[PDB]
Amino acid sequence: SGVIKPDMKIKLKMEGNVNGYAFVIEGEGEGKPYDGTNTINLEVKEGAPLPFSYDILTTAFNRAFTKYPDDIPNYFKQSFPEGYSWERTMTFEDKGIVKVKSDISLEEDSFIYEIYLKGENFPPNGPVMQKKTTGWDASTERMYVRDGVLKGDVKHKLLLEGGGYYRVDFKTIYRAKKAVKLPDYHFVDHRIEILNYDKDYNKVTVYESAVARNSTD
């Protein structure tokens, strides 16, 4: 049988620092790895109230939760039980930058994430530090092998209060902790949202769906 069950739990901890503000968030959730869906409930443990847009954290809160057709090798699911890690750079159009890394492990029927996030150079009157974003657009991530590991690129966008986009390029490198069958170039279509939040985003629920498809259609 599979180490990845059809219903998997999620536990995570993030240590973060954005424009010098340190914080700690813990999360618990669940998802359906084979359906590509996941929901995480986050709680700020240190650093409340967060003085920046929560949207710069949400995509850090696991591509094991991706629906894949059998004919596209699944880099992420094949990596278990050993698991995988990822590191990501998010370059924002006003020169803000987030670097985030996460280690994804498995114990019984929970994935465990250990996340470190550092955001720098956000303008003090920009949409991030002034909490004027409303969420991410739906996106498509381009997945392809480089130097033996899997890269994912996204030409992404945050939506702004009052209309308009705040563009953000994502570059992620995913590293399996064992030899796996490598996929060809393909796409993962995402939609992430904040489902609910309390006043200062101390308690937040995030949902994401993700589905893979070929690059030859």
Question: What are the domain boundaries of the chain?
Answer: 1-217
Indicate the resolution in Å: 1.0
**DSSP per-residue codes, 19-68:** TTEEEEEEEEEEEETTTTEEEEEEEEEESPSP-S-THHHHTT--TTS-B-
Which technique? X-ray
Q: Alpha-carbon distance 95 to 2, whole Å?
A: 43
Q: Alpha-carbon distance 6 to 77, whole Å?
A: 12
Q: Alpha-carbon distance 159 to 198, whole Å?
A: 20
Phi, psi of 119 (to 5 degrees): -110, 140
Q: Alpha-carbon distance 34 to 73, whole Å?
A: 13
Nearest CA to 141 among 187, 184, 175? 187
Task: Give the torsion sign (CA, 54, 143, 156, 136).
Answer: negative
Q: Alpha-carbon distance 162 to 192, whole Å?
A: 20
- Assign domain 1-217 to a CATH class: mainly beta
